[PDB]
Design a protein around this nucleic acid. Structure first.
Ligand SMILES: C=C[C@]1(C)C[C@@H](OC(=O)CSCCN(CC)CC)[C@]2(C)[C@H](C)CC[C@]3(CCC(=O)[C@H]32)[C@@H](C)[C@@H]1O
Ligand SMILES: [Cl-]
Ligand SMILES: [Cl-]
Ligand SMILES: [Mg+2]
Ligand SMILES: [Mg+2]
Ligand SMILES: [Mg+2]
Ligand SMILES: [Mg+2]
Ligand SMILES: [Mg+2]
Ligand SMILES: [Mg+2]
Ligand SMILES: [Mg+2]
Ligand SMILES: [Mg+2]
Ligand SMILES: [Mg+2]
Ligand SMILES: [Mg+2]
Ligand SMILES: [Mg+2]
Ligand SMILES: [Mg+2]
Ligand SMILES: [Mg+2]
Ligand SMILES: [Mg+2]
Ligand SMILES: [Mg+2]
Ligand SMILES: [Mg+2]
Ligand SMILES: [Mg+2]
Ligand SMILES: [Mg+2]
Ligand SMILES: [Mg+2]
Ligand code: NA
Ligand code: NA
Ligand code: NA
Ligand code: NA
Ligand code: NA
Ligand code: NA
Ligand code: NA
Ligand code: NA
Ligand code: NA
Ligand code: NA
Ligand code: NA
Ligand code: NA
Ligand code: NA
Ligand code: NA
Ligand code: NA
Ligand SMILES: [Sr+2]
Ligand SMILES: [Sr+2]
Ligand SMILES: [Sr+2]
Ligand SMILES: [Sr+2]
Ligand SMILES: [Sr+2]
Ligand SMILES: [Sr+2]
Ligand SMILES: [Sr+2]
Ligand SMILES: [Sr+2]
Ligand SMILES: [Sr+2]
Ligand SMILES: [Sr+2]
Ligand SMILES: [Sr+2]
Ligand SMILES: [Sr+2]
Ligand SMILES: [Sr+2]
Ligand SMILES: [Sr+2]
Ligand SMILES: [Sr+2]
Ligand SMILES: [Sr+2]
Ligand SMILES: [Sr+2]
Ligand SMILES: [Sr+2]
Ligand SMILES: [Sr+2]
Ligand SMILES: [Sr+2]
Ligand SMILES: [Sr+2]
Ligand SMILES: [Sr+2]
Ligand SMILES: [Sr+2]
Ligand SMILES: [Sr+2]
Ligand SMILES: [Sr+2]
Ligand SMILES: [Sr+2]
Lengths: 132, 337, 53
RNA sequence: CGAGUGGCUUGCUACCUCGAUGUCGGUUCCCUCCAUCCUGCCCGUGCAGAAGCGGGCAAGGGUGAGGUUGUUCGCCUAUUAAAGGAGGUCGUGAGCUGGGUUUAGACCGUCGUGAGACAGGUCGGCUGCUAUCUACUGGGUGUGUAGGUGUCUGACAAGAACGACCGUAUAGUACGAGAGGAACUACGGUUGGUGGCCACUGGUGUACCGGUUGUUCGAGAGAGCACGUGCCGGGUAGCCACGCCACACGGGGUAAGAGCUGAACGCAUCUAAGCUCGAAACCCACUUGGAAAAGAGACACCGCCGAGGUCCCGCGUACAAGACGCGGUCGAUAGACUCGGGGUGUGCGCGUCGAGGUAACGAGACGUUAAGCCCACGAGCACUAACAGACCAA
RNA sequence: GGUCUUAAGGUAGCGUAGUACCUUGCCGCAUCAGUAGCGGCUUGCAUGAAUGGAUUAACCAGAGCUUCACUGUCCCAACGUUGGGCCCGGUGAACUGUACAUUCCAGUGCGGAGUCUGGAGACACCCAGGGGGAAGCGAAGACCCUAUGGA
RNA sequence: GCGAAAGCCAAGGCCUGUCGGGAGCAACCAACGUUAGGGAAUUCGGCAAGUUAGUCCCGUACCUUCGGAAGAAGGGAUGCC
């Protein structure tokens, strides 16, 4: 993929319960896979900020629950590294649901986003509230 | 069906034993391009600090922006090229012929060497020119040496001597270039061979870690789960199968870790300067105050603070030279925080 | 830049930027200060901070 | 229908072991095979492109994470370039696990007059040993080569030291009615593997500073104890990974293959002689080892009555013994003292306030006080200790 | 089949069960995914009435499953603590020993060789190690068959 | 302190659960502490470890043989002067 412009330390795993930062009716999301990643023997597939991940809805509305939808990691708790050497970390680990053409499933996204996710998934950025 | 996995540790840096010379010994030297000169310098490691730069790469979208880059501070005081050596092309490889020595030596060079009192440079030089005329002269290298007494933070005064190749021009014009440095006193700084912004190769003997186990040494798995409580924690599954009824040298075992010679490739020189610009507040940890000739090497460098490191123009570079970077800020903050 | 907690002159290429729930931004010069905030201690009330003196 | 190769399944035999060669499945760790799942280069096509289909060369590298089940096998989910298969006593229990099989206990179903049975199910049900030899990983001491120091060489040896994907431009271009939609090349990043390093982020830090609970030394101050820190907070050096740095291009010869000149065979023909090209594969490149290479190496210097080393002394860039490295007064090697740089977070005592209370008494706050206490780093400083002196040796 | 054997010929319930072979039965719940677990169906290889059947509050170091919470169980390993481990004094055993024995790659042999054949390799001694090999040590196999054996 | 509970301390007994010396003291093992992010992905199985925790107040479901369930659950409080 296109460079992030920052070094991440993968703060999530497969089976990790993260938040759904949108209005889709999805509250809690559970990571299943990390698009394009191939691991090694005996390693939980790690996910980081700005990764298109395959997800399943844990908590939410009856019509949205039990669905296997794709999403992008918007926020994470583990510090990421900006070029100027500064580290950045968020309050929680969150993601927004996305479609085939990488457009957000909702309209309004909750909480702050990172400026690195903007370059890659711009259709999510031109729908973002706050950008840090 | 037993999932695949690459073997633990590399099998190229073998055998993992203690090094013979703490002083790195190169086995490969650069190709001959233009101007005749020495193919390498050497210094003593000092410590680390970060430096802010301006992105020199025209392929990067960050071209022009401030970027923080880590830098290894290495003091590089002027060396003395005390001699010149020649190799004859024998069917057994490249065997040495003769050496051309000086007159003016260093007051404390007799701490390692048996300093010559009566030498004949003239007729030895004649033998090299007759071997050149014959067409059997190989590569010409200079016996270089360091001045540890120039570094106040290093307790060693006993000079580290090492051989360094000269190349670039025709075999005739480089033999003469070498002889010219020698007749003066052999004084040469880093400015003579290296320009800032260039990619060099730092060779050094690593930090001494003593005898360490398989997990640390070859990065093998610690015993997992239930298998960790039965009395086996950091010991491997087995030494091999039934047949071959012998333990292979490829199986991760215990032994000596560290004090191995490594040749760390493509190291960018960020700045070559003199004075107290890279020094730290409170001095460098387990080293001391840097004031004088130095080099700023990007990233890390093999060996501990006080050990001798060696430089060479990159034998295998990937990126095109981006000379003299705009070094905006160099940190001075204490490494005791 | 200056620290959003202690008021200490942060060395560039050294530091952590903590983003808040709402979206606010706090910078810390070292780990010492990050931990002091999570404890519930205030910079003005603690004598050692460059904010107090 | 016919001809075979393999030794992974099953079956047959009963050669080997009954004075015991420990089971299955799993695990960990190592070498290998090719009958190739991916990656490289190719041939054909029901080859427009695109995504395929089928075949050839090829074992360098890769071939992952999970749900049920003891399972091997298998069914299933999502990622992937792909998530290949097999051998090594169905690799591996003087390595592990002990879920399954296969003890003594018990239940159910079937059979049995009955004890009891079952290639039916089920619950519970143990894992010994101080390594002699050899093997390999690392570490020393002698001998040989035949006085010492420093620098090298390179017979050989090891490597995957690199593999792989994604994205950008090429380009909405070639191609195609359209839908749809590439390449050569130049770039950026990601993953797996590899080696090194710690400025930064993080971890640790029973150094250290602080708060505080019980109790004991009368209170105070200051201390012990509470598992080898009572607990809670912060945490330097160091070591670390979750942090950071670096890990080609190109050549040379081939394979399958595309071809050129070309005859036997007047033509034709890539092949028989000859030649130009062509794989991630082979050699080189690169990295590491490497004078014990018995052809037991080369150069420079120094010395053979003195070169050099050993002991000794002060210590680490070293360290399980040994080894190694530096310094030893022509000296800063270690300690003390002083700075500097750091940790903690405001000392004991006294002073003011203090809910109150007749007073005694008073938890506490402010000031004195970036205070006090502390430091595995650095600088300065010969004050202390590197003194005195032994031995070997052409 | 719409009696026959041998007396009768499975009623209440319960049911793919600790009993069901087929079987990972089919439907459903739950999970991304569930040979598991729970519910329903159930022709039950071969459930079933004191050989007791069914139900159950409470009880249980009894077997199975799911959720919340927690965590170094794992992703993936790091630093630290104490007693060892390593060196010095003293004390001072044993298991095991046909002989020789520096091995390795193949082969051969009673078909599982350090010792045979052919090669390769190999200077001697010593320290620490983790245990690949000696079909390692330990036990005249408990399995299996045999004996005109025992209980 | 509910306590013949823990922890600390007397009276009393002892330093004889009777070998020592040295190395920041390595690997490796036994007990064990703290580990960022994730949180059972480990494994036959949460095995191991962990979490909760005393006392007071509010509050407490299905079911039930009316005894119980139940300390269900859940929520608040807790020192010193
Ligand atoms: C018991 C012998 C065991 C330990 C295991 C044995 O397996 C059996 O003999 C089958 S019965 C196994 C269980 N045994 C108790 C351990 C029942 C008496 C098994 C696997 C074989 C089948 C017979 C030969 C063998 C040695 C070689 C081997 O594989 C062993 C014997 C000599 C070994 O001692
Ligand atoms: Cl996955
Ligand atoms: Cl294990
Ligand atoms: Mg696994
Ligand atoms: Mg620091
Ligand atoms: Mg800091
Ligand atoms: Mg017998
Ligand atoms: Mg055996
Ligand atoms: Mg083939
Ligand atoms: Mg191979
Ligand atoms: Mg086996
Ligand atoms: Mg074994
Ligand atoms: Mg055993
Ligand atoms: Mg079972
Ligand atoms: Mg069982
Ligand atoms: Mg044993
Ligand atoms: Mg069922
Ligand atoms: Mg059941
Ligand atoms: Mg029997
Ligand atoms: Mg009888
Ligand atoms: Mg953690
Ligand atoms: Mg598993
Ligand atoms: Na044990
Ligand atoms: Na075995
Ligand atoms: Na055959
Ligand atoms: Na067979
Ligand atoms: Na096994
Ligand atoms: Na291969
Ligand atoms: Na499986
Ligand atoms: Na076996
Ligand atoms: Na086993
Ligand atoms: Na066992
Ligand atoms: Na080629
Ligand atoms: Na019956
Ligand atoms: Na009981
Ligand atoms: Na732990
Ligand atoms: Na062994
Ligand atoms: Sr196997
Ligand atoms: Sr050299
Ligand atoms: Sr070499
Ligand atoms: Sr055990
Ligand atoms: Sr064998
Ligand atoms: Sr082949
Ligand atoms: Sr292919
Ligand atoms: Sr089998
Ligand atoms: Sr099956
Ligand atoms: Sr069992
Ligand atoms: Sr029984
Ligand atoms: Sr059975
Ligand atoms: Sr001899
Ligand atoms: Sr493209
Ligand atoms: Sr289109
Ligand atoms: Sr104590
Ligand atoms: Sr050809
Ligand atoms: Sr020699
Ligand atoms: Sr009926
Ligand atoms: Sr041992
Ligand atoms: Sr007493
Ligand atoms: Sr005694
Ligand atoms: Sr701490
Ligand atoms: Sr589980
Ligand atoms: Sr599982
Ligand atoms: Sr409560």
């Amino acid at each position: 993929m296109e460079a992030l412009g920052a070094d991440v330390t993968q703060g999530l795993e497969k089976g990790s319960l993260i938040t759904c930062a949108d209005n889709t009716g999805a509250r809690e999301l559970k990571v299943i896979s990390v698009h394009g990643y191939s691991g090694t023997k005996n390693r939980h597939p790690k996910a980081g900020l700005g990764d298109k991940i395959t997800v399943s809805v844990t908590k939410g509305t009856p019509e949205m629950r039990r669905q296997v939808l794709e999403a992008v990691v918007v926020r994470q708790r583990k510090p990421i590294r900006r070029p100027d050497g500064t580290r950045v970390k968020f309050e929680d680990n969150a993601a927004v649901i996305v479609d085939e053409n990488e457009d957000p499933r909702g309209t309004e996204l909750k909480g702050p986003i990172a400026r690195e996710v903007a370059q890659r998934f711009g259709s999510v950025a031109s729908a973002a509230t706050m950008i840090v | 069906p037993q999932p695949s996995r690459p073997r633990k540790g590399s099998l190229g840096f073998g055998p993992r034993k203690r090094s013979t010379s703490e002083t790195p010994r190169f086995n490969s030297w650069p190709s001959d391009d233009g101007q005749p000169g020495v193919q390498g310098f050497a210094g003593y490691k000092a410590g680390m600090t970060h430096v802010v730069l301006v992105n020199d790469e025209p392929n990067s979208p960050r071209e022009g922006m401030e970027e923080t880059v880590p830098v290894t501070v290495i003091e590089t005081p002027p060396m003395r090229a005390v001699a010149l050596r020649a190799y004859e092309d024998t069917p057994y490889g490249q065997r040495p012929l003769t050496e051309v020595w000086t007159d003016e030596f260093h007051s404390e060079l007799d701490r390692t060497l048996d300093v010559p009192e009566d030498h004949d440079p003239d007729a030895a030089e004649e033998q090299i020119r007759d071997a050149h005329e014959a067409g059997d002269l190989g590569d010409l290298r200079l016996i270089t040496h360091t001045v540890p007494d120039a570094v106040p933070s290093v307790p060693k005064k006993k000079p580290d001597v090492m051989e360094t190749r000269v190349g670039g021009g025709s075999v005739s014009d480089r033999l003469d270039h070498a002889l010219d440095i020698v007749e003066d006193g052999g004084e040469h700084a880093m400015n003579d061979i290296f320009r800032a912004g260039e990619y060099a190769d730092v060779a050094g003997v690593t930090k001494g870690k003593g005898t360490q186990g398989p997990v640390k040494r070859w990065g093998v798995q610690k015993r997992k789960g239930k298998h960790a409580r039965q009395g086996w924690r950091r010991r491997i599954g087995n030494l091999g199968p039934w047949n071959p009824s012998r333990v292979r040298s490829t199986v991760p075992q215990q032994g000596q870790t560290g004090y191995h010679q490594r040749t760390e490739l493509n190291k960018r020189l960020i700045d070559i300067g003199e004075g107290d610009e890279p020094t730290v507040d409170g001095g460098f940890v387990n080293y001391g105050e840097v004031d004088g000739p130095y080099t700023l090497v990007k990233g890390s460098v093999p060996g501990p603070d006080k050990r001798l490191v060696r430089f060479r123009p990159a034998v295998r570079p990937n990126d095109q030279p981006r000379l003299d970077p705009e070094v905006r800020y160099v940190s001075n903050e204490s490494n005791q925080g | 830049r200056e620290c959003d907690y202690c008021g200490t002159d942060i060395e560039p290429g050294t530091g952590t930027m903590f983003v808040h729930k709402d979206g606010a931004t706090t910078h810390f010069c070292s780990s010492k200060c990050e931990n002091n905030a999570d404890l519930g201690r205030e910079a003005r009330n603690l004598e050692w901070t460059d904010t107090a003196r």
